[PDB]
Structure 1
């Protein structure tokens, strides 16, 4: 997928709550590498890659994290998942 495209998807859809890779609503569940490994389903136990685990979360929602399946294309979701993985793993935030 395309992380650069994903930065645009993020700006349009995610930055209200996750500017800086943080979380304005639930402060512990950030988009940083340590928090993602602690909290994110699938990724947390090695059953999914970070990209796949983020795509699932984005598509389906959790708590006050909205579901974007049907609002964003599969491509956009894959791209934003690639973007988060890249930002987190590379400590770019």
Structure 2
């Protein structure tokens, strides 16, 4: 934006980003408390499939919903921090990763 800079018709360059990967997003937002799918804050609440499913957290979209209003000691993630597409990726990684 110099004095001589011209108007543009082009728009939306800002949002032309790659889709982030689930593993990286997990490492960034979750692995601190859930390393290797465990739980360092509440030891009984691991991400092991049977345990997630005991509370009805069965699918990718169950994960992506759970993080919006989770249990004590876990922060809630709203949609500015973890947009819907990113929530799905994190759900995918949880389901693909922790038996």
TM-score w.r.t. length of structure 2? 0.71
More helix by share: 1
Structure 1 unaligned regions, length at least 5: 44-48
Structure 1 stretches of 4+ with a deviation exceeding 3 A read none
Residue 42 of structure 2: aligned partner:
26
Question: What is the Cα-based RMSD across aligned positions, in Å?
Answer: 1.7
Of structures 1 and 2, the larger Rg is shown by: 2
User: What SS does the corresponding residue of 1:20 show, helix, strand or coil?
Assistant: helix
Equivalent pairs counted in the alignment come to 79
TM-score w.r.t. length of structure 1? 0.75
**Bigger relative contact order, structure 1 or 2, given CA contacts below 8 A and separation 6+?**
1
CA distance in 2, matches of 1:78, 1:59: 12
| Offset at residue 74 of structure 1 (A) | 1.3
Structure 2 unaligned regions, length at least 5: 1-19
